[PDB]
């Protein structure tokens, strides 16, 4: 019964687990960081910059794509402005570009202009992916544009992952409540500790032979490899990339120290009705994206050498974790 | 044996659990927040202001009732003064009003005057509801006034909930030691982590077809929905409402910042013999109650949309939680 | 095998548990706080002041005994001086008095002089009670003085409790590493979380029909009732009593605030070779012992009313706990 | 399946466990602290100073050996300079000396010069011992120099311990991520909580009849005895010894207080490509090594008396632990 099972489930977060070292014949410099997200999308590094207004526009998307990654242009701008940002990326050496779409009335014209601008991947980006409004949008976007790779989310269960893959999504984005700037857990009382969310969703994805994006809660390079080893094909970063020069924000000074503004897409300012589910704050200026990425991938490479993971397929399928206390 | 089972039980609090997101066809704006506490009592929002001297008098009770909620007038005043506070609420558009009663000698005349003043619900409010003094009072008040909805508490077990429902209570109030200002755990060594207390008591309540009030420990809107999803029909708030203008306290200033006094009904000052089980302190001035309630219900609505809970019956009966570590 | 079972055991401390409230017909004022520690020793309150140099001498022992408790005169003084301290207590209205004895050469003459001074209970007080030196001393002291109540400790297992009771002890004192000023856990890597230590030792004591003293780690009145409900007949306090006027220390002033010195009997200063296992520090001046005791017993009474424990026998045998997280 | 077992393993650290006190006929002064690491290597105390540049050179190695211990001369210097440091130790009364070797090209000439200088034990010191590069080096060094005691590591599993012992190692060094200055867990996402790592590796070592070194994470004397009781034959210290006069660092002054530099062998400065896995910081000046060791062994002796461990064989094989919460 539903009553009896209320408190049955146990979930894990990044800080609850560590990768166990294993037999390795491969050096960190020699590991393969590439991942196939779909038939058309192949990334050299498993990192995607977040579809947020304090994180990704053309400057971030170009820089990300030049590192072998990908950037999701945020939808908190006009249809034309978004298509123009997509154009800048494509005109920068035919770089892979992703763009965010919602469920609202404006989606129909937005998706056409983005596809027209030469977008590679469309991202149905919502707070609650396990909904009718989102399922219908997935069916619609996939019927209208079958050549464009479709990402749909956010979800945190196997049932939600099943339903999105069945509706027509190519990639499912996982994460409900783990984000650094997220207040959903405290406001709505809802969330799935991210390691369990990734694992439960990837368990389902493995059946469909499809990819998942581990979105939110990544604090360091160690969280990146843990997110991939739990089942994620690629990770999505907000906090770790917001402080870089390439993020759309303006560099500010406060008591000598250089800072950049980072906020939730559900914060008061970003929403400009729904009660806020995100915060707005300050994050230290990081410098060039390229240097942030190099440090992050260095740590991921170190971990793949420790686990004897020659590639990401060997990490996702074979790497073992140990649970531990605080 | 009693000896062998000493440490058998495991209990959970709000911070130990989160609601798992589920299939949803309903938007937060569209969810139904109403709850039937008894045949005569129907609330538009599942919130009740606490029967405390730094929380509820006529000003709080009117404001609460105008939001679709309910206020429990505290019993730390004279019989006539209490009846007059009840009168003010009833004379304010026939608003639903609740009033607190004890077990002491003065209860007999107090209950008559409150009923005379047009009270809708009587609350036998004690520290230890699983007692002979309380069982007898429930039988007495229900025989004398069968038309008035009777709330009895506080309890934290199924056995206590059974005994109150059998004695004649319509609603059982759950909470032993979780209150923000409570020191019972540290003083008396007694308590039941509130999520388990609600669930164990609601498991019993479901058999009798009766309602339970989740009383104490609520820090944010996320704790409200967790308390309801664990089995509570409505929640009781102290701390979250004490800082509002409508609370009986006087607005004070200390080093520029505006504060309001909030104290336990078992603190030294409130008791004015029993050793203190509550603290007296300062809480930031919140402003209008109406705005505090709107933010709180906004978060509860967000959570009901995440879980696909069209109403509170679907939340209490079907919503699933995950346990997690610190 | 010993190898396979290395990490089998799980242990609990005070902060891991709470008493579950139960059916109660008794009020806190009406509960019985008396306990029979032996055929000759009957205490009105289950509290014993610690056999420490910053805690108990004649002034503490008299004050303790006048509250219905007991004081253990420390052995960090001359034989004659100790006997004189015992005399002062006996000459103060025939008050019950306890005195500490070791295992060293001086024990033989010390025990005779203390018995001569009219001591009621002798305490073989050691860091490691589960030893040959201690077993032999128990046999010796019990053969030589069969009319004097013998306490032996400290221990933290059933096997140790069995061996002391079999050697001739009347009461076994439980506690290895829980003391507020103790550093044994960090220095020696040894300890048994105190709730489990009490329960495991009391499980053994129940077979012999004998009493146990829950010694160390008590921070508040809630820890007192938890220690008794876990199986302890009486508790021993260091930290909670050291700040009182009756403790042998001198009242000092530091930056306006009044303090008293409290130290481990295994600290550098107290030892005046063994590496230190205790710390020396400052504790706030508490005032009169009588007031400290009244507050503490008030909390214990509150808890006995919550659990429906009319007496300590009903607490120790029937009271149930719940485990919980941080 | 590998997928299903991803989160099966549970691991423990020092802070998760305590030694249970047991029947003891031995006093701390009387316990035997000696350990046989190999046929040729016998230590009077189970302590080895770390093969680090802010910890061990000739001055540390001589002082360690004079306490009955051992020092591993670090390999972050020239071949001749290392052999000269080894010479100074041997010329200081034929004291036991250990020296670090890697897997790199320079290893072949380095190992010859160290053996020529009269080294007793060679240490193949790596970040990831469960590798082909390390297995091959073990086979090579053991074939070329069968008279010199070979230590190989670092590892954290039974499989890794098996493979090193089979390749020709005499002693396996255990520790992946527990070091005070280590950032591997946060950078690479890899680690095995040290108590479990020691126990899992020693379970394997017991089959081969060989010794293991518990390396890293030791904060106090309590962690030393816990590391040995979990299966370690001897411990390796970095942090605890870095502040002593005998460490190669220079004594510095900062705001009155005396400090010494302590850094990871994977920190930026020490590496002078791999991303850093260690930090560089300041540690308080401790004084003479001899005094640090005396305090540490005093605590280990206290613990062996509590557990009735007459020797280290009785500790490793019979001592029992209890798990506990935070
Ligand atoms: C106001 C709030 N705004 C956002 C915006 C962007 C987000 N982006 C990612 C994530 C979340 C986000 C929340 C929350 C869950 O974690 C991932 C939001 O839309 N609330 C909401 C609540 C319930 C339902 Cl049914 N629909 C929507
Ligand atoms: C002094 C103390 N005062 C209060 C007052 C209001 C309360 N209101 C709610 C709650 C508690 C309260 C305690 C404590 C448990 O959590 C809920 C109280 O009456 N102690 C008490 C102890 C044992 C028994 Cl048999 N009877 C009464
Ligand atoms: C130096 C240290 N001094 C004390 C003094 C008083 C104590 N009083 C109570 C307790 C402890 C105490 C330790 C430690 C355990 O918790 C209770 C002590 O004697 N160490 C010790 C170690 C091993 C063995 Cl075989 N024998 C003795
Ligand atoms: C840069 C990093 N430097 C060090 C240096 C000394 C160490 N010494 C002891 C330990 C560790 C150490 C790491 C890390 C694990 O804990 C014990 C290192 O070499 N990374 C590394 C990563 C993966 C692989 Cl396949 N190979 C090497
Ligand atoms: O306001 C918000 N509430 C909750 N989650 C958010 C909000 N805005 C963005 N997110 C999520 O948080 C992620 C970033 O997480 P981070 O990398 O930990 O900062 C984004 O990629 C979104 O999925
Ligand atoms: O002094 C007291 N001791 C213990 N609980 C108290 C005391 N006074 C009130 N309470 C409870 O605490 C609740 C308020 O909890 P809060 O909303 O967390 O502040 C009240 O509704 C009472 O049930
Ligand atoms: O130096 C010491 N090391 C360890 N335990 C000690 C020491 N001195 C006294 N104790 C114990 O600590 C108890 C006091 O604990 P407290 O009430 O938590 O301060 C005493 O009654 C002794 O059993
Ligand atoms: O940079 C590094 N990263 C990780 N571990 C390190 C590093 N340098 C040394 N170690 C390990 O840390 C141990 C010292 O640990 P400690 O005694 O806790 O400071 C050394 O003996 C090495 O095994």
Residue numbers in the entry:
A (entry chain A), B (entry chain A), C (entry chain A), D (entry chain A): 0 to 93, 220 to 397, 413 to 466
The authors write:
GuaB catalyzes the oxidation of the substrate inosine-5´-monophosphate (IMP) to xanthosine 5´-monophosphate (XMP) using NAD+ as a cofactor, and guanosine 5´-monophosphate (GMP) synthase converts XMP to guanosine 5'- monophosphate (GMP) to generate guanine nucleotides essential for cell growth and viability. Indeed, genetic studies have shown that de novo guanine biosynthesis is essential for growth and viability of bacteria both in vitro and in vivo (10–23). Here, we present the first high resolution co-crystal structures of A. baumannii, S. aureus, and E. coli GuaB proteins (cystathionine beta-synthase (CBS) domains deleted), each determined with a matched set of three different inhibitors bound. Similarly, the NAD+ binding region, also where our compounds bind, occurs at the junction between neighboring molecules with side chains from both protomers contributing to ligand binding interactions.
The novel S. aureus and E. coli structures crystallize with one molecule in the asymmetric unit (asu), yet re-create the common GuaB tetramer arrangement via the fourfold symmetry operator of their I4 space group. Common to all three species’ structures, the amino- and carboxy-terminal ends of the protein are engaged in mutually reciprocal strand swaps with their neighboring protomer around the tetramer. We observed a tight overlay of structures across the bacterial strains, highlighting common critical interactions required for potency. These inhibitors mimic the NADH/IMP cofactor interactions by forming strong π-π stacking interactions with IMP while also hydrogen bonding with the conserved glycine (Gly299Ab/302Sa/300Ec) which is one of the two hydrogen bond interactions observed with the NADH amide. The ligand linker segment induces a 90° bend, directing either the amide N-H of G2 and G1 or the imidazole of G8 to form an important hydrogen bond to the conserved glutamic acid (Glu416Ab/417Sa/415Ec) while directing the aryl tail group into a hydrophobic shelf region. Differences in the polarity of a particular key selectivity residue specifically (Ser250 in E. coli versus Ala252 in S. aureus and Ala249 in A. baumannii) was found to be critical for inhibitor interaction with GuaB which corroborates the observations of previous reports. The key residues (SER-440 and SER-250) in the binding site of GuaB E. coli contribute to a stable and extensive water network (more green and well-connected spheres) predicted by WaterMap analysis with the pseudo-apo crystal structures. To disrupt such water network, the compound needs to pay a larger desolvation penalty leading to poor potency, whereas the same compound binding to GuaB in S. aureus and A. baumannii does not need to pay for such penalty with a less favorable water network (more red and less connected spheres).
